[PDB]
Amino acid sequence: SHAAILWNEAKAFIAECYAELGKAEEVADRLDSIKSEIDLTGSYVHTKEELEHGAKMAWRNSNRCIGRLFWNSLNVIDRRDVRTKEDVRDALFHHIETATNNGKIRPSITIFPPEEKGEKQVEIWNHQLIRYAGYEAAGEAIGDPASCSLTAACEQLGWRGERTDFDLLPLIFRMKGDEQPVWYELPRSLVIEVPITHPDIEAFSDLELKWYGVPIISDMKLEVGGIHYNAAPFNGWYMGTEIGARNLADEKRYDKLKKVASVIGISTNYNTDLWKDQALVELNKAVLYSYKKQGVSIVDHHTAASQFKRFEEQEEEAGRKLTGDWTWLIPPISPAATHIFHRSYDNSIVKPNYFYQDKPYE
Amino acid sequence: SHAAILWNEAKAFIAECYAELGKAEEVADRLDSIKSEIDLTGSYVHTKEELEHGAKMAWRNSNRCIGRLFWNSLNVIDRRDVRTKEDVRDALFHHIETATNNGKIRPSITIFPPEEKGEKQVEIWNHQLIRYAGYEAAGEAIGDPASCSLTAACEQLGWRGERTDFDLLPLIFRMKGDEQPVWYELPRSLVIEVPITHPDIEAFSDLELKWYGVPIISDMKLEVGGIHYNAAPFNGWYMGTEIGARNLADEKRYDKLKKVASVIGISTNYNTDLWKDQALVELNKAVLYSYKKQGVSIVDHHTAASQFKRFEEQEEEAGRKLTGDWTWLIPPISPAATHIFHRSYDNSIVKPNYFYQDKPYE
Ligand code: HEM
Ligand code: HEM
């Protein structure tokens, strides 16, 4: 069944949604109208309000997210009107632009058309609109290993990277009707990057490290009232450790710890020296310092956790049960220094929410 | 039922145990003998071999433990012969002694008599044989907050601390038949302590930090073949972060981070400086350095995780399924630098094992 599943979800969503918006009386007629539409067309269409809030509710229900305090300030851009590839390209460009906001990043989400009878109207391949390529010749590795398969997929369609450690992959999506996707390179004037330097250590720039300024997840599905928005790229700002303790530090990512240990002048001879731990704190300090120097929003794990704590409180004050995933909520650097580590969370899925979906490539 | 539960467990344990020891043929007669005994006495008695190995199997099945690589080298001290309070005192003293082994700590466990008809023969109150007291006057806090309730309990029986931050609590247990427990102060010549200093920073000793040299958990129950050893204190060596990132760093424990940040000469003004993170790495480095300076065994989280990895491998080579608890396996400092962080574990309880039991005080 599908006509049953939908109408069920719809009644639940519209009820909770209007309850929060203060339009409990309008639940009656709206649900009558949706009933006709589901039987008439075989689905329904959300209003700019239902969807905007639905996107905000899905944010608040994101267990694995430490920054849900600002759920209610999401900038929902409604682009369910797109019909061509140029329309999609221009919307992603706009999204990157307005979201970046010259450095003062703005949490935003672009809502593209949802699936009709299970068939997607638009299909975004990218994990994040802005991301570096990854290559691994029979010899060694160049770039972000995490991007390996998507990079392969793009080179299969005519795209070719210069092969540096920081090649910006192109935008890649498929439109309903097209068998294969299309790609568009990102105008470099749209993409803000940040070179990594250290406040006290002058040698740190020899590492020639840098990272893009805005993470825009683009491969997740957004479920709201039974409607599946398979394409709805969203973004918040970065949390220092995502770049300094994972992207640049993981052995399966960039793996910069030995290098960092060297430029900061410490030995990588013994584990008892805790050099990896000392290197992580200098790299993480460098990352927070650079983004701040350049005027691009970022947050350290202490402020974030502290902000998350205030969320937990607000959720109780409003009467909503709280859900969270401890294994992803704790920062990868000094978890036991934040309150998140010491308490527990109910890892229960509540819709509306964002879900993983199967990669088209691979 | 209880006679049924026992015989069930017994058949399973003896089978797996002898299989590992290479005495599969002896499983027959031994199980016949245990059958008589269970119906004759209403329980059975393990052999020095069954119990020794049972204690080692329970170690290997400890999900929350990162050091199971040395499960097979446990030093099982059989003291199921104790009958008086002096017998128990002398056994705990001996345990502390032989286990400490002048600094070259030895993983050990003292097996006391198990429960008969649910009634304990010996009941140990202490969480760890060696541990500091905790006090909180209407005014401020002195000592280890974690010890607050046990300390209260001891002062209720005549014990009185000098009230420093590091008062060694006394040994406290109850013998079957006695209504209230008894206490015995620990001879200070038995207890090894380690003052905390830093390899490069001379000011670090102004903090006047120290920690005992051996953690001996004494409030856990050991289940082997249906038999419940409620009193069986065990110990391994320390892993630096247990002292440097938790005991001395937690806000509900000692809370030394602001102080450490000061002696190392860094500001505690902004979170973006990552001072807590910088302080944790200096304190953790200091702890590993001091214990090593004094010749008391200790292991850093990198070597430990690396040692745990080898365990995972061995468990697969031997054909045993592996169980683990990720939320306790990852070190509290730089978890994403160890392989444990990046994989997952089956948190399934397999007996023989160690279990929590209800505190007599409280
Ligand atoms: C205010 C800025 C934000 C901060 C500081 C923040 C931070 C984080 C962090 C640290 C994670 C962990 C990701 C990882 O470990 O890989 C995460 C995950 C997540 N966040 Fe947020 N976030 C922000 C905004 C948002 C927004 C705008 C949305 C959606 C409308 C959102 C949805 C999610 C979801 C669904 C995940 C799961 C990611 C996954 O499993 O792939 N977050 N976020
Ligand atoms: C080789 C030395 C050992 C090391 C390095 C080691 C390390 C650890 C660590 C780091 C934990 C975490 C404790 C916490 O986070 O509070 C732990 C837990 C545990 N270990 Fe081990 N361990 C060692 C020996 C042993 C021995 C000898 C036994 C028993 C025969 C054992 C039984 C357990 C159990 C049951 C836990 C659970 C503790 C609890 O939940 O209270 N370990 N160990």
PDB file of C-alpha atoms in Angstrom, chain B residues 128-308:
ATOM      1  CA  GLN B 128      37.820  -0.325  45.259  1.00  0.00           C
ATOM      2  CA  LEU B 129      40.037  -1.623  48.092  1.00  0.00           C
ATOM      3  CA  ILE B 130      42.190   1.530  47.798  1.00  0.00           C
ATOM      4  CA  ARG B 131      40.233   4.775  47.299  1.00  0.00           C
ATOM      5  CA  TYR B 132      40.105   8.316  48.711  1.00  0.00           C
ATOM      6  CA  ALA B 133      37.314   9.593  50.953  1.00  0.00           C
ATOM      7  CA  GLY B 134      34.851  12.306  49.996  1.00  0.00           C
ATOM      8  CA  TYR B 135      33.268  15.021  52.139  1.00  0.00           C
ATOM      9  CA  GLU B 136      30.905  17.945  51.568  1.00  0.00           C
ATOM     10  CA  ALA B 137      30.261  20.183  54.548  1.00  0.00           C
ATOM     11  CA  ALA B 138      27.332  22.594  54.284  1.00  0.00           C
ATOM     12  CA  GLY B 139      30.204  24.775  53.066  1.00  0.00           C
ATOM     13  CA  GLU B 140      32.523  23.360  50.394  1.00  0.00           C
ATOM     14  CA  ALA B 141      33.890  20.037  49.104  1.00  0.00           C
ATOM     15  CA  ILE B 142      36.934  18.099  50.322  1.00  0.00           C
ATOM     16  CA  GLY B 143      38.123  14.904  48.636  1.00  0.00           C
ATOM     17  CA  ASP B 144      36.501  12.637  46.056  1.00  0.00           C
ATOM     18  CA  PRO B 145      32.760  13.380  45.662  1.00  0.00           C
ATOM     19  CA  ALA B 146      32.322   9.914  44.183  1.00  0.00           C
ATOM     20  CA  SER B 147      33.091   8.514  47.661  1.00  0.00           C
ATOM     21  CA  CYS B 148      30.521  10.673  49.497  1.00  0.00           C
ATOM     22  CA  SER B 149      28.002   7.984  50.464  1.00  0.00           C
ATOM     23  CA  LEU B 150      30.496   5.253  51.400  1.00  0.00           C
ATOM     24  CA  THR B 151      32.399   7.792  53.518  1.00  0.00           C
ATOM     25  CA  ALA B 152      29.183   8.718  55.334  1.00  0.00           C
ATOM     26  CA  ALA B 153      28.573   5.013  55.956  1.00  0.00           C
ATOM     27  CA  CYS B 154      32.043   4.514  57.464  1.00  0.00           C
ATOM     28  CA  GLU B 155      31.804   7.507  59.785  1.00  0.00           C
ATOM     29  CA  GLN B 156      28.595   5.904  61.019  1.00  0.00           C
ATOM     30  CA  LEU B 157      30.695   3.004  62.359  1.00  0.00           C
ATOM     31  CA  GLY B 158      33.328   4.989  64.219  1.00  0.00           C
ATOM     32  CA  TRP B 159      35.767   5.824  61.409  1.00  0.00           C
ATOM     33  CA  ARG B 160      36.926   9.454  61.127  1.00  0.00           C
ATOM     34  CA  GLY B 161      39.044  11.004  58.390  1.00  0.00           C
ATOM     35  CA  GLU B 162      41.620  13.766  58.796  1.00  0.00           C
ATOM     36  CA  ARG B 163      39.707  15.526  56.022  1.00  0.00           C
ATOM     37  CA  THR B 164      42.381  16.113  53.395  1.00  0.00           C
ATOM     38  CA  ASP B 165      41.688  15.674  49.691  1.00  0.00           C
ATOM     39  CA  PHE B 166      43.373  12.277  49.815  1.00  0.00           C
ATOM     40  CA  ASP B 167      42.307  10.297  52.864  1.00  0.00           C
ATOM     41  CA  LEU B 168      42.587   6.554  52.326  1.00  0.00           C
ATOM     42  CA  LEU B 169      39.243   5.024  53.296  1.00  0.00           C
ATOM     43  CA  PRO B 170      39.440   1.864  55.401  1.00  0.00           C
ATOM     44  CA  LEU B 171      38.563  -1.667  54.344  1.00  0.00           C
ATOM     45  CA  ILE B 172      34.915  -2.348  55.171  1.00  0.00           C
ATOM     46  CA  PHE B 173      32.996  -5.618  54.954  1.00  0.00           C
ATOM     47  CA  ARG B 174      30.306  -7.693  56.684  1.00  0.00           C
ATOM     48  CA  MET B 175      30.522 -11.413  57.561  1.00  0.00           C
ATOM     49  CA  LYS B 176      27.472 -13.743  57.337  1.00  0.00           C
ATOM     50  CA  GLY B 177      25.780 -13.608  60.716  1.00  0.00           C
ATOM     51  CA  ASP B 178      26.926 -10.092  61.567  1.00  0.00           C
ATOM     52  CA  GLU B 179      24.274  -7.425  61.325  1.00  0.00           C
ATOM     53  CA  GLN B 180      26.650  -4.524  60.676  1.00  0.00           C
ATOM     54  CA  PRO B 181      30.038  -4.531  58.860  1.00  0.00           C
ATOM     55  CA  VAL B 182      33.480  -3.952  60.354  1.00  0.00           C
ATOM     56  CA  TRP B 183      36.351  -1.730  59.232  1.00  0.00           C
ATOM     57  CA  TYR B 184      40.145  -1.928  59.221  1.00  0.00           C
ATOM     58  CA  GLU B 185      42.424   0.998  58.279  1.00  0.00           C
ATOM     59  CA  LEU B 186      44.966   0.222  55.557  1.00  0.00           C
ATOM     60  CA  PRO B 187      48.612   0.092  56.696  1.00  0.00           C
ATOM     61  CA  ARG B 188      50.170   2.963  54.709  1.00  0.00           C
ATOM     62  CA  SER B 189      53.202   0.805  53.831  1.00  0.00           C
ATOM     63  CA  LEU B 190      50.953  -1.362  51.648  1.00  0.00           C
ATOM     64  CA  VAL B 191      49.540   1.514  49.592  1.00  0.00           C
ATOM     65  CA  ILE B 192      51.650   2.913  46.750  1.00  0.00           C
ATOM     66  CA  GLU B 193      50.790   6.475  45.681  1.00  0.00           C
ATOM     67  CA  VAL B 194      52.240   8.673  42.936  1.00  0.00           C
ATOM     68  CA  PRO B 195      52.715  12.465  43.117  1.00  0.00           C
ATOM     69  CA  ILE B 196      51.946  14.155  39.800  1.00  0.00           C
ATOM     70  CA  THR B 197      54.725  16.109  38.082  1.00  0.00           C
ATOM     71  CA  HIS B 198      55.324  17.241  34.492  1.00  0.00           C
ATOM     72  CA  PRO B 199      58.394  16.494  32.327  1.00  0.00           C
ATOM     73  CA  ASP B 200      58.827  20.065  31.027  1.00  0.00           C
ATOM     74  CA  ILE B 201      56.777  22.217  33.412  1.00  0.00           C
ATOM     75  CA  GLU B 202      58.318  22.726  36.854  1.00  0.00           C
ATOM     76  CA  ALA B 203      55.316  24.622  38.262  1.00  0.00           C
ATOM     77  CA  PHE B 204      53.063  21.572  37.859  1.00  0.00           C
ATOM     78  CA  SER B 205      53.901  20.243  41.319  1.00  0.00           C
ATOM     79  CA  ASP B 206      52.304  23.234  43.049  1.00  0.00           C
ATOM     80  CA  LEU B 207      48.980  21.601  42.294  1.00  0.00           C
ATOM     81  CA  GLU B 208      50.002  18.914  44.809  1.00  0.00           C
ATOM     82  CA  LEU B 209      48.166  16.203  42.887  1.00  0.00           C
ATOM     83  CA  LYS B 210      48.614  12.487  43.515  1.00  0.00           C
ATOM     84  CA  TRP B 211      46.763   9.248  42.890  1.00  0.00           C
ATOM     85  CA  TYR B 212      46.994   5.711  44.239  1.00  0.00           C
ATOM     86  CA  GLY B 213      48.848   3.164  42.114  1.00  0.00           C
ATOM     87  CA  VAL B 214      46.411   0.278  41.782  1.00  0.00           C
ATOM     88  CA  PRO B 215      42.646   0.188  41.012  1.00  0.00           C
ATOM     89  CA  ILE B 216      41.069  -2.881  42.605  1.00  0.00           C
ATOM     90  CA  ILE B 217      37.306  -3.082  41.896  1.00  0.00           C
ATOM     91  CA  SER B 218      35.631  -4.810  44.825  1.00  0.00           C
ATOM     92  CA  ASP B 219      31.870  -4.380  44.525  1.00  0.00           C
ATOM     93  CA  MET B 220      31.184  -6.521  41.468  1.00  0.00           C
ATOM     94  CA  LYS B 221      29.681  -9.992  41.338  1.00  0.00           C
ATOM     95  CA  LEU B 222      31.325 -12.783  39.390  1.00  0.00           C
ATOM     96  CA  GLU B 223      29.040 -15.401  37.823  1.00  0.00           C
ATOM     97  CA  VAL B 224      30.613 -18.705  36.773  1.00  0.00           C
ATOM     98  CA  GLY B 225      28.580 -21.859  35.949  1.00  0.00           C
ATOM     99  CA  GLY B 226      25.550 -20.758  37.975  1.00  0.00           C
ATOM    100  CA  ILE B 227      27.663 -19.984  41.079  1.00  0.00           C
ATOM    101  CA  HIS B 228      27.616 -16.388  42.377  1.00  0.00           C
ATOM    102  CA  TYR B 229      30.882 -15.088  43.791  1.00  0.00           C
ATOM    103  CA  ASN B 230      29.548 -11.835  45.243  1.00  0.00           C
ATOM    104  CA  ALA B 231      32.971 -11.097  46.749  1.00  0.00           C
ATOM    105  CA  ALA B 232      35.878 -11.352  44.308  1.00  0.00           C
ATOM    106  CA  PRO B 233      37.992  -8.133  44.146  1.00  0.00           C
ATOM    107  CA  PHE B 234      40.056  -7.876  40.954  1.00  0.00           C
ATOM    108  CA  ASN B 235      42.554  -5.504  39.364  1.00  0.00           C
ATOM    109  CA  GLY B 236      44.523  -4.623  36.246  1.00  0.00           C
ATOM    110  CA  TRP B 237      46.801  -1.603  35.820  1.00  0.00           C
ATOM    111  CA  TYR B 238      45.629   1.938  35.109  1.00  0.00           C
ATOM    112  CA  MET B 239      45.089   3.542  31.748  1.00  0.00           C
ATOM    113  CA  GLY B 240      46.247   7.136  32.000  1.00  0.00           C
ATOM    114  CA  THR B 241      42.969   8.771  30.992  1.00  0.00           C
ATOM    115  CA  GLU B 242      41.091   7.136  33.900  1.00  0.00           C
ATOM    116  CA  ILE B 243      43.094   9.385  36.232  1.00  0.00           C
ATOM    117  CA  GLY B 244      44.038  12.326  34.051  1.00  0.00           C
ATOM    118  CA  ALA B 245      40.829  12.758  32.054  1.00  0.00           C
ATOM    119  CA  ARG B 246      38.206  11.591  34.539  1.00  0.00           C
ATOM    120  CA  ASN B 247      39.172  11.282  38.202  1.00  0.00           C
ATOM    121  CA  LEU B 248      41.140  14.565  38.256  1.00  0.00           C
ATOM    122  CA  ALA B 249      39.319  16.352  35.417  1.00  0.00           C
ATOM    123  CA  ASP B 250      35.545  15.767  35.873  1.00  0.00           C
ATOM    124  CA  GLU B 251      33.503  18.565  37.397  1.00  0.00           C
ATOM    125  CA  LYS B 252      31.862  16.049  39.689  1.00  0.00           C
ATOM    126  CA  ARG B 253      35.163  14.502  40.668  1.00  0.00           C
ATOM    127  CA  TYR B 254      38.246  16.578  41.385  1.00  0.00           C
ATOM    128  CA  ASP B 255      37.831  19.346  38.773  1.00  0.00           C
ATOM    129  CA  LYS B 256      41.487  20.349  38.250  1.00  0.00           C
ATOM    130  CA  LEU B 257      41.289  21.792  34.720  1.00  0.00           C
ATOM    131  CA  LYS B 258      41.163  25.502  35.622  1.00  0.00           C
ATOM    132  CA  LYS B 259      44.111  25.017  37.987  1.00  0.00           C
ATOM    133  CA  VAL B 260      46.095  23.040  35.416  1.00  0.00           C
ATOM    134  CA  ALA B 261      45.406  25.708  32.811  1.00  0.00           C
ATOM    135  CA  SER B 262      46.882  28.251  35.194  1.00  0.00           C
ATOM    136  CA  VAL B 263      50.092  26.447  36.093  1.00  0.00           C
ATOM    137  CA  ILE B 264      50.754  25.740  32.414  1.00  0.00           C
ATOM    138  CA  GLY B 265      50.282  29.452  31.807  1.00  0.00           C
ATOM    139  CA  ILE B 266      47.260  29.638  29.516  1.00  0.00           C
ATOM    140  CA  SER B 267      44.080  31.691  29.752  1.00  0.00           C
ATOM    141  CA  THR B 268      40.719  30.262  30.710  1.00  0.00           C
ATOM    142  CA  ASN B 269      39.041  33.234  29.064  1.00  0.00           C
ATOM    143  CA  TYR B 270      37.637  31.812  25.849  1.00  0.00           C
ATOM    144  CA  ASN B 271      36.350  28.430  24.661  1.00  0.00           C
ATOM    145  CA  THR B 272      37.856  29.144  21.217  1.00  0.00           C
ATOM    146  CA  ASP B 273      41.319  28.815  22.777  1.00  0.00           C
ATOM    147  CA  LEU B 274      40.504  25.170  23.641  1.00  0.00           C
ATOM    148  CA  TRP B 275      42.231  25.601  27.032  1.00  0.00           C
ATOM    149  CA  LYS B 276      40.331  22.667  28.571  1.00  0.00           C
ATOM    150  CA  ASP B 277      41.536  20.535  25.702  1.00  0.00           C
ATOM    151  CA  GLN B 278      45.082  21.879  26.101  1.00  0.00           C
ATOM    152  CA  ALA B 279      44.990  21.375  29.865  1.00  0.00           C
ATOM    153  CA  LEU B 280      43.721  17.754  29.526  1.00  0.00           C
ATOM    154  CA  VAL B 281      46.646  16.798  27.291  1.00  0.00           C
ATOM    155  CA  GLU B 282      49.201  18.310  29.688  1.00  0.00           C
ATOM    156  CA  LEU B 283      47.640  16.646  32.744  1.00  0.00           C
ATOM    157  CA  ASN B 284      47.365  13.327  30.935  1.00  0.00           C
ATOM    158  CA  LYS B 285      51.006  13.651  29.830  1.00  0.00           C
ATOM    159  CA  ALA B 286      52.002  14.456  33.400  1.00  0.00           C
ATOM    160  CA  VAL B 287      50.191  11.381  34.789  1.00  0.00           C
ATOM    161  CA  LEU B 288      51.788   8.941  32.367  1.00  0.00           C
ATOM    162  CA  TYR B 289      55.199  10.533  33.024  1.00  0.00           C
ATOM    163  CA  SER B 290      54.988  10.351  36.824  1.00  0.00           C
ATOM    164  CA  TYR B 291      53.791   6.735  37.094  1.00  0.00           C
ATOM    165  CA  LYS B 292      56.585   5.801  34.674  1.00  0.00           C
ATOM    166  CA  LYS B 293      59.114   7.821  36.644  1.00  0.00           C
ATOM    167  CA  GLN B 294      58.190   5.947  39.810  1.00  0.00           C
ATOM    168  CA  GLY B 295      58.137   2.497  38.239  1.00  0.00           C
ATOM    169  CA  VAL B 296      54.384   1.795  38.564  1.00  0.00           C
ATOM    170  CA  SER B 297      52.804   0.215  35.461  1.00  0.00           C
ATOM    171  CA  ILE B 298      50.448   2.323  33.359  1.00  0.00           C
ATOM    172  CA  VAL B 299      49.307   2.453  29.718  1.00  0.00           C
ATOM    173  CA  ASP B 300      48.347   5.335  27.426  1.00  0.00           C
ATOM    174  CA  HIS B 301      45.116   5.127  25.423  1.00  0.00           C
ATOM    175  CA  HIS B 302      47.033   4.651  22.147  1.00  0.00           C
ATOM    176  CA  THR B 303      48.952   1.566  23.248  1.00  0.00           C
ATOM    177  CA  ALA B 304      45.810   0.197  24.980  1.00  0.00           C
ATOM    178  CA  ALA B 305      43.559   0.592  21.941  1.00  0.00           C
ATOM    179  CA  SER B 306      46.352  -0.861  19.870  1.00  0.00           C
ATOM    180  CA  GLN B 307      46.479  -3.796  22.295  1.00  0.00           C
ATOM    181  CA  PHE B 308      42.724  -4.137  22.191  1.00  0.00           C
TER     182      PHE B 308
END
